Design a protein around this ligand. Structure first.
Ligand code: CA
Ligand code: CA
Lengths: 439, 52, 79
């Protein structure tokens, strides 16, 4: 019916479990994390890029004065100068010798090539986890996606899978993130409406085509000096360019746990951390009555050789006897040894070779062939290959991580160190009562 | 947007030892090499490597 | 389907986009050629009266080549 399990969150390594009911033949269970996604809820703050200053044509009045006006353009700046007497190709352009007033303006706008080279500032909330499993039971295979929250019944057809809450909540993104051309950076951008010149976000707008651009780039207008018409000015360096030069390295290369950052929507894929408490409701159709399944009269296991390598660096064989033929499941009732095969044909008497893997220097686990638990023991040597290109299939234990001989040595030493004290104690007490009874 | 063509560097040769690998890299022009552990903490590195 | 930088022919293959509208047939059914608007003709490719681009040496060789047979017309080549 219902089975509770705890599959490690590693994308690709299978997990084998054995579920059974009284009067029903045991059924193999296979759980795999095919792919995982970590999609956090995002809110767009503004859009920034490299500004392009616009200097409109100057306005001058021959004999008069001009008053600076107020405009809604970003970083608008206006100045008025008292005596200019400007020149162009053709000579002087006004008759007053010193009553010439010139008006200068300068605002900023989005560069024409900002539709491709532009960054987006985002704020990210709590991250949610969604995975796609490949549950296998009996002779059937199922694929499904579910949300790891503990309440969502993500089920393909009738699997009724309920993935419990993740053991540890982890999120590679800090509160504020910046996206640019598919590269995700962890940056602390200034909040909307508070722009510091010469830094990131010196110009911002709700959208690239928004008409309410706001910016603060520290535009300064200067007094003209040359005779011909001019609008001298000086400005801070483009903060977007500065940030691009000092970007650092992206989350695609900084994020931990082997996460693969990808965008549209922003998410982290195939992260490896923690455990998932799944719960499966297997339909009764898959289960088969124990009477129909063949029974094993006896079974003895012998193991050829073993190395506790990450891959399936182990071998095993067993003799068996049965009164029928069919398919039986094989399972290893240990947390430090995983078989490769789930089921295997059986024909009366014979022998089957099964490959396994372990991370302990002892193949001292229990193997069952549709029941009939059997004990194996071997002499597991360390592996030769220093480096392999495949993740470890079993988490390293401790109680099993120590060799039998070392366990024996430590046990004998501690036993002697605990026995001599007690024997001294008892002889002391017997002599003490002897002395008390002396008089 | 379109597609460009970019060079593929000479494939390195790995020398494997206990709890550590060694890369033998050759590059006529500057090339990027980044590493990151897959554990809880990621000691990301970045280096522009030129020459052998 | 394939990533949008790759064009898919009407056969089941995906090739790079640089092969589209390039003057060369790469799809088995030639779907990457007769779909774009290119109409240029090289110096050695004489342009027939129907607009099709045909090599110059094809002209007035004794056999019809163009759809209307402008190559064999006595007006183009005088015998
Ligand atoms: Ca083509
Ligand atoms: Ca001809």
């Amino acid at each position: 019916f219902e089975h509770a399990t705890t599959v490690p969150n590693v994308p690709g390594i299978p997990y084998k479990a054995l579920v059974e009911r009284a009067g029903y033949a045991p059924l193999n269970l296979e759980i795999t994390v095919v792919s995982s996604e970590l999609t956090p809820s995002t809110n767009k703050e503004y859009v920034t890029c490299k500004f392009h200053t616009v200097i409109p044509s100057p306005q001058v009045k021959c004999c008069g004065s001009l008053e600076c006006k107020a405009s809604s353009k970003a970083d608008y700046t206006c100045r008025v100068f008292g005596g200019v007497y400007p020149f162009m190709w053709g000579g002087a352009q006004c008759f007053c010798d010193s009553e010439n007033t010139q008006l200068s303006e300068a605002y900023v706008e989005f560069a024409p090539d900002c539709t491709i080279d532009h960054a987006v500032a985002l704020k990210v909330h709590t991250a949610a986890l969604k995975v796609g499993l490949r549950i296998v039971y009996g002779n059937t295979t199922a694929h499904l996606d579910t949300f790891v929250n503990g309440v969502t019944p993500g089920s393909s057809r009738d699997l009724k899978v309920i993935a419990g809450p993740i053991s540890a909540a982890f999120s590679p993104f800090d509160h504020k993130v910046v996206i640019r051309k598919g590269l995700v950076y962890n940056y602390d951008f200034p909040e909307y409406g508070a722009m510091k010149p010469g830094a990131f976000g010196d110009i911002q707008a709700s959208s690239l085509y928004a008409t309410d651009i706001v910016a603060r780039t520290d535009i300064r207008l200067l007094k003209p000096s040359v005779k011909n018409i001019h609008v001298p000015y000086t400005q801070a360096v483009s903060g977007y360019e500065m940030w691009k030069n000092n970007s650092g390295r992206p989350l695609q290369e900084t994020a931990p746990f082997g996460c693969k950052i990808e965008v549209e929507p922003l998410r982290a894929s195939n992260c490896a951390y923690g455990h998932i408490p799944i719960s499966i409701d297997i339909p009764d159709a898959a289960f088969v009555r124990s009477s129909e399944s063949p029974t094993i009269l006896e079974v003895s296991c012998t193991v050829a050789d073993c190395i506790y390598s990450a891959d399936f660096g182990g071998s095993l064989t067993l003799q068996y006897k049965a009164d029928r033929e069919g398919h039986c499941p094989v399972h290893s009732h240990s947390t430090t040894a995983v078989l490769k095969e789930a089921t295997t044909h059986v024909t009366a008497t014979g022998s089957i070779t099964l490959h396994f893997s372990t991370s302990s220097p002892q193949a001292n686990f229990i193997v069952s062939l549709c029941g009939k638990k059997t004990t194996c023991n071997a002499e597991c040597k360390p592996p030769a290959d220093h480096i392999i290109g495949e993740p470890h299939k079993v988490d390293q234990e401790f109680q099993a991580a120590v060799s039998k001989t070392s366990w024996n040595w430590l046990l004998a030493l501690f036993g002697g160190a605990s026995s001599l004290i007690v024997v001294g104690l008892i002889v002391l007490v017997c002599s003490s009562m002897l002395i008390n009874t002396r008089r | 947007p379109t597609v460009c063509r970019v060079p593929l560097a000479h494939t390195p040769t790995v020398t494997k030892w206990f709890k550590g690998i060694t890369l033998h890299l050759t590059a006529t022009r500057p090339t990027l090499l980044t590493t990151r552990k897959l554990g809880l903490r990621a000691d990301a590195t970045a280096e522009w490597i030129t020459g052998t | 389907k394939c990533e949008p930088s790759q064009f898919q022919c009407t056969n089941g293959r995906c090739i790079t986009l640089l092969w589209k509208c390039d003057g060369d047939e790469d799809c088995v059914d030639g779907s990457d050629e007769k779909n774009c608007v290119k109409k240029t003709c090289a110096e050695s490719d004489f342009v027939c009266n129907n607009g099709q681009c045909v090599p110059s040496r094809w002209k007035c060789d004794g056999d019809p080549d163009c759809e209307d047979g402008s190559d064999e017309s006595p007006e183009q080549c005088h015998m």
